Design a protein around this ligand. Structure first.
Ligand SMILES: Cc1cc2nc3c(=O)[nH]c(=O)nc-3n(C[C@H](O)[C@H](O)[C@H](O)COP(=O)(O)OP(=O)(O)OC[C@H]3O[C@@H](n4cnc5c(N)ncnc54)[C@H](O)[C@@H]3O)c2cc1C
Ligand SMILES: Cc1cc2nc3c(=O)[nH]c(=O)nc-3n(C[C@H](O)[C@H](O)[C@H](O)COP(=O)(O)OP(=O)(O)OC[C@H]3O[C@@H](n4cnc5c(N)ncnc54)[C@H](O)[C@@H]3O)c2cc1C
Lengths: 151, 90, 356, 90, 151, 356
């Protein structure tokens, strides 16, 4: 029987398909429960759950969760879960841009370059990929160029 | 409306290149800009979220037997007998 | 010359003459004044109502321009910043209607000025995101949140959101969380004092066994950190004098961009397959392993070892949805760009969209 | 039946490692065998198939006007006037 | 107006998202039509269509097809299409195993090794990945070992 | 010693003493005799009714064993060998009920003996798969199909399905198909005589411009082919004498396994980014570019430049579905393995499955 976790915030690491699990940093006020990021993984780790559809995933997720915290947790499981796959999202078409070796020096300077009256911004135009800071950072930069741009 | 056209003097494209890959463009952006759009790799990631009646992860061992036996008579020991499966997907 | 240019982009450094610190200019335009001289008011097409779009579309609108923000999604803005929460009029994502969780972005670094300050300016409350489990009976979070603070590589210049709050102190972190690998399971506190146990699980033999995967990685990065910065007797680091701090990074771009993070730990840091296995497992670098060394190196959570993470009260959505209240007339939902025609000498832009 | 157990003396596992990744196993396979199952990268691929009334790709130019004008009056020239869009997703 | 293709069998290459298109090597006897592999791509090229769901894909597929053969083809398009994504298949969970650099020498010999009474076979156990030959080749090899295995 | 072991696995070579040619043994067991001495009849659990499973489950059943083939799919066997076709009782995949196409495997190489012969043995008709567009008014395909033929690295030994058919001759290939890149479009025949045009489209400058991407790649592989084989005055290649032909490949494993196909074309073959771009585009190596050099190198469609491809009449499904007619009692559909318990000293196996 898995020991009481007794942990506040943070998260744990594992080699089971769930990989990383995070616990709520603060509890929603006025509530007795909470939602845990049972499974969160990138690349191939993620490529896995991508095989299964939204609805199926919850099963394993709970099992792999029990493998680390104990079968016992199953009692509090409300039976409600949510899953977000970014490769399957026709609007994100992926989590974020992440260069493979050499790509940056191969064409990143061309990524930022505007094309005629067309300007580019967003997470990927920066060099702080998979971060909002990159997004914002390039958003501003974009507005600066078009703002003072010769009409 | 089947379609809808917009116009201006300047444009800021903020969609990810993975999505821009399917937009028809003209004239062609600069050769390198195209390659970057064809070649920029977008990593995949999936999050799975489960809801719990209580914040068990906060629990101590006492909290567990306490909280657990509250739901139903001798539910704590019921799981102690059961134990933990030895099969992992690791 | 492409290497130096990259370091510039990486570092946010302007052109050779002045070598302006762009983080300052952006902080300026986004937090302080806004677009300074509102140039020739023009018609502007912004595709995508993600954070990038909403921010530019807002600065530009506020500076008098005819801004239109085309968004393919029919019910949500924010893009990769989504948050599950009960939506007035339909079923709540979870049994408890008051619960919510992140489907995308969830934490904001202290060393991310723009976003931090941006969240504040919009009058959004930001709580501490615990990257490591903490001892809930320590630190004082009820004090007013410390302000955003930035320090430029340019001779002692900075930037802040406002007056300090020495009353505020982050809870102390216990590592009562787990690391379960190879059927073994221990707490993070333990793994810290003695990595032997679970490292052997990955079959680490000898020397490697007596080090945590982290330090193993840090140890491996020092030689590179050396390109641009310099080790400090006290055990810290200070970037070399600009000229070198620039040429160094440009050198890092010339030397390690052709390395996948794995081929680097392996061939360069001469780590064993078992070491890379433990490393990639304990701190997600297994799936990335074959992706560019840079993506993993920049992320390097070092720099500010005492930095802090944050999270927006109510959800990550709060940030994009607040910016959206303003651009109420600019944003057009359910419209997917499918065609893009622009005019280039050597109306300027036409974008055709389909209904979603 | 919620479940169903099988038994034998030997077993041949022919499913891809990506799928085996979700099977609970015991006892644990050899350390390296596990890593190979956690780490073997499975590439993605997608095929899209479209059906055509005729085998146009076989067509010659004559075949086209011929075959095309057969469907409806002066349909051949109708497309010659139309021409080809200049926008590509390349 | 794109020239008549006038090609029998084979296929064409392009940088538009369709990438590779193949034409039927032989026509189904007794039919007047045919189906073309409008779009077939691996890895990232494939990762793209993976963003869209089954039903949506047919659109672009036809457009990118027209970009090379002419808008004209649209007349013969029956309006019927089929799409197979292997990452989205919970049974294939991907097209095939394809090693990233160093993986083979890192653990391929351990891939083949049997574990107790458990034997492994299939495309990935071989070294002819993404091929049936590998599959079969290892299938036989497997049957040989278990066949003469001490009961 | 791990390198040599890999070459063995790659090459299909038995242990050091004899150095048996495994392709022969497999051809033997699968086509000729079957499992020779049907050892201690035992109970056997085979998971997966894909081609691998169906073949082993068939050889083993035919040799008297209690075989059970557990298959997660509820309506289809064949796995990654699927074919869209009208299914007695429901809507046809295409408007014309007689049409069908491959969702997975579609072509079979001449140098793939096992599968080719296997298809024949099962009494399946196999037509020629045109990897390159052809001139439909050439060659004679009505002649009886040539038989499978294999040649071992072992002193002039071979293997065939049967009597030759010198009447059979493959159609001549025209390259009237297209290559449309960078808005330019030309036929393959043209690109062949003059790669300049579309190569410049990728910005290839100078020498590189006057070569097709293929040859550019072949040129790049020669030095490696040299590890194991030797160039031939006539412009062909013959593997070195076994001892070296083994140590060579083992060397190829030691030297290029740590190379992604791209990092090899780039750093080793010293190709320019534009060259790699054209190459990766014209012959799908752009998406793979960051995957192991080996996966791309082995595939190397060279070896048999006069080889041939094939396709099963009626669909790829024919192969797995025919093997299935036999194992009618062994195969169990709609059952997904979820748990696997086995006993290992230092019933033997229990597999739990869920209904699909
Ligand atoms: C799982 C996950 C976790 C993350 N965690 C963090 C974190 O903790 N901290 C952090 O800082 N960052 C995190 N990020 C990254 C951060 O969210 C992104 O970098 C940032 O939001 C990207 O903003 P963007 O404006 O560039 O693009 P996006 O937010 O992707 O927005 C692009 C917009 O364009 C729209 N669009 C796309 N194509 C079209 C089209 N053809 N026509 C019309 N509209 C279109 C989309 O619907 C969307 O709204 C995470 C991302 C993911 C996926
Ligand atoms: C798009 C594409 C094109 C291809 N083109 C070619 C080509 O032209 N020529 C060629 O030779 N090869 C080609 N291949 C590769 C070839 O098809 C495969 O290498 C081969 O079929 C793999 O056989 P397998 O028996 O190893 O595995 P699979 O065929 O994948 O079969 C595994 C089986 O296990 C079942 N299964 C999985 N998990 C479980 C579980 N937990 N419980 C129970 N059952 C389970 C599956 O449903 C499946 O039937 C292609 C593959 C793809 C994806």
């Amino acid at each position: 029987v898995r020991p009481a976790t007794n942990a506040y915030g943070g998260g744990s690491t594992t080699d089971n398909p769930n990989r990383f699990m995070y616990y709520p940093s603060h509890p929603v006020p006025g509530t007795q429960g909470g939602v845990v990021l049972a499974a969160y993984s990138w690349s191939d780790d993620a490529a896995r759950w991508d095989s299964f559809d939204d609805a199926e995933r919850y099963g394993y997720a709970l099992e792999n969760l029990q493998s680390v915290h104990g079968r016992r947790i199953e009692v509090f499981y409300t039976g409600a879960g949510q899953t977000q796959s970014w490769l399957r999202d026709p609007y994100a078409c992926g989590e974020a841009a992440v260069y493979t070796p050499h790509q940056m020096t191969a064409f990143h300077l061309d990524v930022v370059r505007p094309e005629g009256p067309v300007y580019f911004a967003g997470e990927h135009v920066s060099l702080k990929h998979a971060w909002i800071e990159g997004a914002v950072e390039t958003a501003v930069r974009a507005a600066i160029a078009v703002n003072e741009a010769p009409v | 409306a089947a379609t809808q056209t917009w116009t201006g003097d300047l444009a800021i494209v903020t969609i990810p290149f993975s999505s821009l890959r399917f937009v028809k463009v003209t004239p062609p952006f600069s050769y390198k800009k195209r390659r970057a759009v064809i070649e920029t790799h977008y990593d995949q990631a999936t999050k799975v979220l489960l809801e719990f009646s209580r914040r068990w992860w906060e629990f101590t061992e006492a909290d567990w037997k306490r909280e657990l036996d509250a739901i139903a008579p001798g539910l704590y020991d019921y799981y102690q007998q059961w134990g933990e499966d030895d099969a992992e997907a690791a | 010359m492409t290497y130096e240019q990259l370091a510039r982009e990486l570092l946010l450094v302007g052109p050779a003459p002045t070598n302006e610190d762009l983080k300052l200019r952006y902080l300026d335009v986004l937090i302080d004044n806004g677009l300074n001289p509102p140039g020739p008011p023009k018609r502007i097409l912004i595709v995508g109502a993600g954070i990038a779009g909403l921010v530019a579309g807002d600065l530009l609108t506020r500076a008098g321009h005819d801004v239109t923000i085309l968004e393919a999604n029919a019910n949500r803005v924010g893009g990769r910043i989504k948050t599950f929460h009960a939506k007035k009029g339909e079923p709540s994502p979870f049994a408890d209607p008051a619960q919510y969780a992140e489907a995308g972005a969830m934490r904001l670094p202290s060393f991310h000025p723009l976003t931090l300050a941006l969240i504040d300016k919009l009058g959004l409350k930001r709580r501490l995101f615990f990257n490591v489990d903490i001892d809930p009976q320590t630190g004082n979070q009820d004090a007013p949140v410390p302000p955003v603070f930035y320090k430029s590589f340019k001779d002692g210049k900075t930037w802040t959101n406002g007056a300090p709050s020495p009353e505020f102190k982050e809870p102390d972190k216990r590592n009562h969380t787990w690391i379960r690998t190879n059927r073994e399971q221990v707490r993070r506190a333990q793994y810290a004092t003695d990595p032997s146990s679970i490292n052997e699980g990955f079959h680490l033999t000898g020397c490697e066994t007596r080090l945590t995967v982290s330090d193993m990685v840090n140890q491996a990065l020092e030689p590179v950190r050396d390109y641009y910065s310099v080790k400090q007797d006290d055990g810290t680091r200070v970037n070399k004098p600009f000229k070198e701090w620039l040429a160094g990074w440009a050198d890092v771009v010339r030397d390690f961009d052709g390395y996948s993070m794995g081929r680097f730990l392996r061939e360069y840091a001469e780590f064993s397959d078992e070491a890379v296995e433990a490393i990639g497992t304990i701190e997600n670098m297994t799936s990335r392993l074959h992706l560019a060394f840079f993506h993993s190196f920049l992320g390097r959570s070092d720099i500010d070892p005492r930095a802090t993470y944050w999270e927006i009260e109510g959800g990550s959505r709060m940030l994009p949805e607040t910016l959206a209240k303003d651009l109420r007339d600019q944003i057009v939902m359910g419209q997917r760009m499918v065609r893009l025609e622009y005019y280039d000498p050597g109306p300027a832009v036409a974008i055709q969209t389909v209904p979603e």
